[PDB]
Amino acid sequence: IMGSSVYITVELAIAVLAILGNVLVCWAVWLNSNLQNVTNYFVVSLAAADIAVGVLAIPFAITISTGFCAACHGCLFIACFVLVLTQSSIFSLLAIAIDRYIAIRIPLRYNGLVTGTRAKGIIAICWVLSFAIGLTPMLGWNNCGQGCGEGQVACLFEDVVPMNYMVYFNFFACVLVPLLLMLGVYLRIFLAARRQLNIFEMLRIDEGLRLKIYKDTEGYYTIGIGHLLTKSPSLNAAKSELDKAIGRNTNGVITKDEAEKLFNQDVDAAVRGILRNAKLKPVYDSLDAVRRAALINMVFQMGETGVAGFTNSLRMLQQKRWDEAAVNLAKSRWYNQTPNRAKRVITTFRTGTWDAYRSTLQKEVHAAKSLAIIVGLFALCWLPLHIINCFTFFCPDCSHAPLWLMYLAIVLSHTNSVVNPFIYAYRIREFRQTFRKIIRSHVL
Ligand SMILES: CCNC(=O)[C@H]1O[C@@H](n2cnc3c(NCC(c4ccccc4)c4ccccc4)nc(C(=O)NCCNC(=O)NC4CCN(c5ccccn5)CC4)nc32)[C@H](O)[C@@H]1O
Numbered sequence: 521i522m523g524s525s526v527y528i529t530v531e532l533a534i535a536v537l538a539i540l541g542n543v544l545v546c547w548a549v550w551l552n553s554n555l556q557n558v559t560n561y562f563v564v565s566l567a568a569a570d571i572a573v574g575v576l577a578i579p580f581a582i583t584i585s586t587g588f589c590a591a592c593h594g595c596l597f598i599a600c601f602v603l604v605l606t607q608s609s610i611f612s613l614l615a616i617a618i619d620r621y622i623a624i625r626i627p628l629r630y631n632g633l634v635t636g637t638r639a640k641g642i643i644a645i646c647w648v649l650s651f652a653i654g655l656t657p658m659l660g661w662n663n664c665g666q667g668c669g670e671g672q673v674a675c676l677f678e679d680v681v682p683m684n685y686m687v688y689f690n691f692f693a694c695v696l697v698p699l700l701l702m703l704g705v706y707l708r709i710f711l712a713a714r715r716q717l718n719i720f721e722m723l724r725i726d727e728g729l730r731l732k733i734y735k736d737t738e739g740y741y742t743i744g745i746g747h748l749l750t751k752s753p754s755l756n757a758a759k760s761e762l763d764k765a766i767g768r769n770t771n772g773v774i775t776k777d778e779a780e781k782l783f784n785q786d787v788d789a790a791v792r793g794i795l796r797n798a799k800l801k802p803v804y805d806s807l808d809a810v811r812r813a814a815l816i817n818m819v820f821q822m823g824e825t826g827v828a829g830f831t832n833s834l835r836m837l838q839q840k841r842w843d844e845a846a847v848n849l850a851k852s853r854w855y856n857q858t859p860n861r862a863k864r865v866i867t868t869f870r871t872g873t874w875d876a877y878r879s880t881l882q883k884e885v886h887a888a889k890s891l892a893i894i895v896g897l898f899a900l901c902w903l904p905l906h907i908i909n910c911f912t913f914f915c916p917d918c919s920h921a922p923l924w925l926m927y928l929a930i931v932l933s934h935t936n937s938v939v940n941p942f943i944y945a946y947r948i949r950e951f952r953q954t955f956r957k958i959i960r961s962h963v964l
Pocket residue numbers: 581584585586602603606607610676677678686690694905908909912920923926927929930933934
């Protein structure tokens with residue numbers, strides 16, 4: 521079997537899978553309303569980039585390898601488009617990555633930051649950037665300012681696209697940097713996923729963390745986790761009290777480190793409050809650190825009068841009757857009014873461990889494994905090819921990778937540029953379910 525014949529065959533087999541698989545992803549997002557959030561706007565956008573990679577880029581990439589005599593600029597144009605379209609995937613994959621970072625690590629600012637308007641804008645930015653970079657060769661940086669006769673060359677990627685372009689501008693800027701950002705995103709999600717738990721993380725999950733001043737339920741300026749600054753209607757008075765509490769000019773913004781110093785002051789304040797209260801003091805003294813955190817949690821929610829309202833349930837906690845206490849607390853107005861928060865706090869009371877709060881993280885251990893898969897593929901599929909280029913460009917004298925290896929590298933580059941949404945999308949239950957619903961219907 522001819523080598524070239526095996527290349528064209530595998531490459532078109534990829535072309536089709538790309539089309540079929542990614543249509544599938546856009547189909548799912550079209551039916552299921554519950555899939556029509558903003559993340560999936562980035563997913564579809566990649567879906568689409570990848571469809572054009574399958575329908576256009578791959579056929580042009582094949583052409584580029586046959587070496588027929590073409591007008592240099594005609595063959596430059598074909599070459600450029602494959603660069604544009606593969607470029608679009610990479611960046612579009614990166615928007616997906618950055619979308620996830622914000623959704624997992626700064627979830628209280630995600631809506632008012634990645635809205636539908638901005639998403640569509642960011643997609644414009646990706647596509648415009650792809651053209652800018654991929655069309656650069658045509659604006660002059662190319663291999664034919666000065667066999668086949670005059671004006672024509674053998675149509676092969678390396679005959680029209682300069683190797684210094686591909687290494688210095690394209691590799692370093694359009695593969696290495698995107699990859700490196702994706703790596704940092706993965707790692708930072710991972711550290712969030714597997715974070716150590718304590719009273720600070722506990723209340724962040726229940727109340728949120730703000731690093732910037734916001735007006736509250738009833739118009740009062742606040743910061744961190746639940747920290748009232750002033751009742752005064754002035755942002756300027758608010759920031760002034762913030763500076764006095766922190767110890768520098770904030771301009772209304774703090775660090776996570778600093779909001780922990782605040783939270784701890786508020787905790788000390790709740791403990792002092794509890795110690796003065798004769799209905800709570802004994803219950804608090806009898807408990808262990810983690811159940812103490814549960815008791816303090818209720819207080820931050822209801823104040824101390826309210827917590828002292830649970831006479832029966834407080835009694836049972838003092839007598840160490842955990843299951844009997846849990847059931848008692850679950851009958852309240854508190855449970856019915858805010859059930860998620862209460863069930864987590866009641867489990868904490870039942871167990872003396874952080875389990876209820878740990879489970880809240882399993883959805884981001886999920887997200888981190890996904891990013892890991894994407895980034896690992898991405899490195900696998902894009903590096904051999906660009907590493908091959910660098911060796912050719914820096915060390916032209918030295919031993920070559922053999923033909924089948926160099927060509928496999930291209931095949932790999934195009935596999936990632938197609939099967940990327942699908943893996944991300946396949947690992948989500950809501951997608952996986954919709955896939956099944958089409959497959960056992962419109963197909964059959
Ligand atoms: C977002 C970024 N986008 C991309 O990276 C996309 O752009 C395309 N691309 C990116 N570098 C590409 C690239 N490097 C050129 C590289 C090479 C060649 C073949 C396979 C992989 C890499 C090369 C290395 C060394 C010398 C010249 C080119 N060759 C092609 C592309 O068609 N080659 C196929 C067509 N040529 C050829 O058979 N020449 C032959 C190969 C064997 N000979 C050798 C070998 C060693 C030394 C001298 N002579 C004679 C020339 N395509 C590329 C590819 O589709 C990527 O997905």
